[PDB]
Design an enzyme around this catalytic site. Sequence first.
Site, short mmCIF file in Angstrom:
data_model
loop_
_atom_site.label_atom_id
_atom_site.label_comp_id
_atom_site.label_asym_id
_atom_site.label_seq_id
_atom_site.Cartn_x
_atom_site.Cartn_y
_atom_site.Cartn_z
N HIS A 129 0.86 -1.14 0.00
CA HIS A 129 0.00 0.00 0.00
C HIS A 129 0.92 1.22 0.00
O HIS A 129 1.99 1.24 0.62
CB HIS A 129 -0.90 -0.03 1.26
CG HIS A 129 -1.86 -1.18 1.27
ND1 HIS A 129 -2.92 -1.25 0.38
CD2 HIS A 129 -1.89 -2.26 2.07
CE1 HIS A 129 -3.56 -2.35 0.68
NE2 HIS A 129 -2.97 -3.01 1.68
N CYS B 103 0.16 2.46 -4.63
CA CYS B 103 -0.64 3.59 -5.04
C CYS B 103 0.22 4.83 -4.82
O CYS B 103 1.00 4.86 -3.86
CB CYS B 103 -1.91 3.68 -4.19
SG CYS B 103 -2.91 2.17 -4.16
#
Lengths: 415, 420
Positions: free
Chosen positions: B122, B164
Site C-alpha cells: 500500500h 498507489c
Amino acid sequence: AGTKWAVLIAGSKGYQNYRHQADVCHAYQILRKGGVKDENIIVFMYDDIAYDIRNPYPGTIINSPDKKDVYKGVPKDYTGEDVNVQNFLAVILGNKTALTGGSGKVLDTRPNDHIFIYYTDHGYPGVLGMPTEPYLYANDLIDTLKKKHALGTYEGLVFYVEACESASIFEGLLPDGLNIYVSTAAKAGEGSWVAYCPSQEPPVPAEYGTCVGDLYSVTWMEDSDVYNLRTQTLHQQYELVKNKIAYASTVSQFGDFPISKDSLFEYMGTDPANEKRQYEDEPHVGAVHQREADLHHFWDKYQKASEGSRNKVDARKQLVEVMLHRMHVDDSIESIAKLLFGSGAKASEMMNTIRPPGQPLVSDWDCLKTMVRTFETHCGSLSEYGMKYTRFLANICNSGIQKEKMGEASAQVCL
Amino acid sequence: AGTKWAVLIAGSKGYQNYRHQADVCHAYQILRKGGVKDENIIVFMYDDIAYDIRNPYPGTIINSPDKKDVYKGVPKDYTGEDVNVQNFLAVILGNKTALTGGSGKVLDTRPNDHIFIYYTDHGYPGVLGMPTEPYLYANDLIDTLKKKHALGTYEGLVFYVEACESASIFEGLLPDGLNIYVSTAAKAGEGSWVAYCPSQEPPVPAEYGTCVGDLYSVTWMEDSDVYNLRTQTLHQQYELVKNKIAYASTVSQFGDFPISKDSLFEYMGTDPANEKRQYEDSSSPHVGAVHQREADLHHFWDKYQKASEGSRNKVDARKQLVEVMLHRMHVDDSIESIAKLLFGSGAKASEMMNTIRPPGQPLVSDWDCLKTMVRTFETHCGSLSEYGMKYTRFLANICNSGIQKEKMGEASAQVCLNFP
Ligand code: NA
C-alpha cells in the site's frame, strides 16, 4: 618446529575495569590448558582487582556468569606501574634491558616461533589506553611490530585487540607482508561492548558490582575453550566472532590474511580434553558500550539509593557532575573548533568525519601527540571521556593547523 | 566486477494482503534462478501468509493462476515485527548494529556492486506502508538513498515500487547523479491495480479467497521470468510494463535515466534455461478493475459469502466486514468534518483534501509537520494504519497552508468526540 609465545595485556586499572583483567586471566587459562608454557606467556595486568575491597570474593577473578575463577596461577610479569608503554614495547622486541621493572620475561623469540598478542581495555581513535601515563599511540605500536619483523624473530604473529575504535590502531598503518594477522573488536567510530553485567543479559551475581567481561573477548575465548583448536583456523574464529557480535560492533582484520589459514592450535595450543570436539562450520550476551560502563554504575548507585537519604543526594550530585564534565569537555572542543574553523562550528561533523577505509587516522603522529598535550596544558587532562577527541585533534593535524594556533585557541576558550 | 544484491520488501500483513508477500516471493524466485545469491538477497516479509488459517494450501504462496508455489526457499531475513522502517533503512545503509532484530543480512555493499530494491504494498501520498506503524515517509527513504550514495558503496541502484501514489515517494525529492534509477507503479492521485483475484479476468481458483498478485508487479516479473535478461534493458522493461498497464495506472521513472541502459541481467541475473529467448522490441489481457483497497475487501467479502448461513463463521465474517466498512466511513467522515472545520466551507475543505501539487514538486515542504499531523489525527480519531493514510495528501496541504498541530488537534477532538 617453534615455540608458542603470548603477550596478554589489560590496558586499564580500577575495579570499574574488572573486565579487562578478567579477560587477560581467562586468555591465560586457555593458553595454559592448550600447553603454552608460563615462561612463554608474558602477562601485563595492573593486579588491583583480586584484592580490591569492592571484590566480593577476594583472591578470585571471574570472566563469565559460571563464576569460574580465572585468576589462579596467572603470571605477574608486569603489574602496577610496570604496565606501561615502555615495558609493553620492549617485551614485544625481546629487550630485557629496556624495562622499567617487572619479571624481565620478554618475547626473546626465534625465527620459527609463533606469537599471540592479546590487548584488552579502552580504545580511542589511534590510541590504546594504559593504566599509567602515557597512552599507547598506534604509530609506536606499528613501528614496534615493523622493528620486530625486521629482526625476523617469528614465523607468525597474531594480535587480538579488545577496545573501542581498535581498527584505527591498524587501518592505514600496518603493512600486509609482516607475517602479522590482526583482529580488532570494533571499527573506527565504533564503541566495543562489555559482557556479563549484574543487570543486563546472562545473570552475573549482583555482589560483583561490575561487568566481568568484554563482548568480543568472551566470544573468542569461549569459542577457544570448547574446541579442538587444530580443527578451527584463525580465519574461522574471525568469522565466528564477527558474525556472533555483528549486532554490537564490527570485527575487523588487518595485515597478512594467509596467516589466518593457520589453525588456532598454532598460536593457542589445544586442550587434550577437547580432542573429540571438532569444529564443523567456516543468544546476545552484549550488555552496554565500554565508554558508558562507568556511567551505568553511577546511575545504578543513584537508583538503588534510598529515597530522601544522604546516599541518594550524594549519588545524584556525583552523577550530575560526571555528566556536566562531559558537557564541559564537549563545549571546550566545540569552542576550539569554532575559533580555528569559523562560527559555523563543525566540531561534531569533523568528529563524525572518519577518513576513507585504508587511510591512517592522522598523517603526522607527532602532531597528534602535540595536539593532545597542547589541549591538556591549557584545558584539563582529556583522560577516559575526552580521549575520543583524538579524532578531532587528528583532523586539525591533517588540516595543517599548527600547535601555536591550537595553543592560541585552547588558551582563549579555557582561560 | 561487482556483486548483485537485492532488497525485497512487502510493506503489509494480513491474509487480505496475501498478494504483496506473493509478489516478494516471486521476485526472490527470479533472482535465485538468475544466479543472485541468498547472502545478497535481503527479504522483508511479515510471513503470516504461508501458514495463515485461511490459506487453502499451507506452506505454499502463489503469485499467478498457474498455482506455482513461490514460497519455497524464500529467505526470512526480517519477518513479523522486524519488518519495520528502522530495519529497512539500516539494511539499505549496510548497518548491522542499527537493527531491532532479524538475520542481520544487510546491504554491506562495495563500490562496484549493483542493488535491486523492490517494494510492494500500500502506498500513500509521500508515505509507504509498513506492516505496523510507523510507516515509511518519503523524506527518510530519500535521505537514506542520499546517505547510501555519499558512502559510495554501489555502482548502480534500481528501485521498483509497487504502491498507489508511488511517484510521490520520489517526485520533488530524488535528485539526479546518485546512480539510482526508479520505476513506480502509479503516479500521484492514482491507485495501483491488483491482479489475479478470484473474480478478475484470468481468475485465481476461489479457495485462495484473496487476490494473489499486483498488476505492475506480475507484469515486470512475468516478463523477467521468460527472457534472456542480457537481451532486455531496464528501459525496455519500463516501456514494456508502462505500455502494458497504461489502462490501469501510469508507470513513472525517476533518477538517472542512463542507468536504465543496463540490461536486466546487471541487477536480476539471468536464468540459463531462457538463454535462447531473446527479447524483441497478442495484446488482449486486461485485468478487471480491482484497486488495492478493493482487493483487501475481496477477502473479507469472500470469507463472509462462502461461510454457511446460520454458522458462527458467517456471523464473525459479517461482523468483521461491517466493522471494516464502518471504519472506512468513520475515517472519511472525520477527515471531511475536520477539513470543513479548518477551512470553513465544503468547497475549500474539498480543495484541501484533493489538491495535488504541480509535477516535480515534493508532496509537503515540512515532513516533520506531516508526521505530526498524522499522529495528531490518530491521537483523537484513531489509527489511519488499517485505512485512511491516503489522506496524507490532505494533511500535507494543511502543513503547506501553515496550519499548526494545535489547530489540527482542536478540530480533530471536536469532530471525533462521540461520548454522552
Ligand atoms: Na485507519
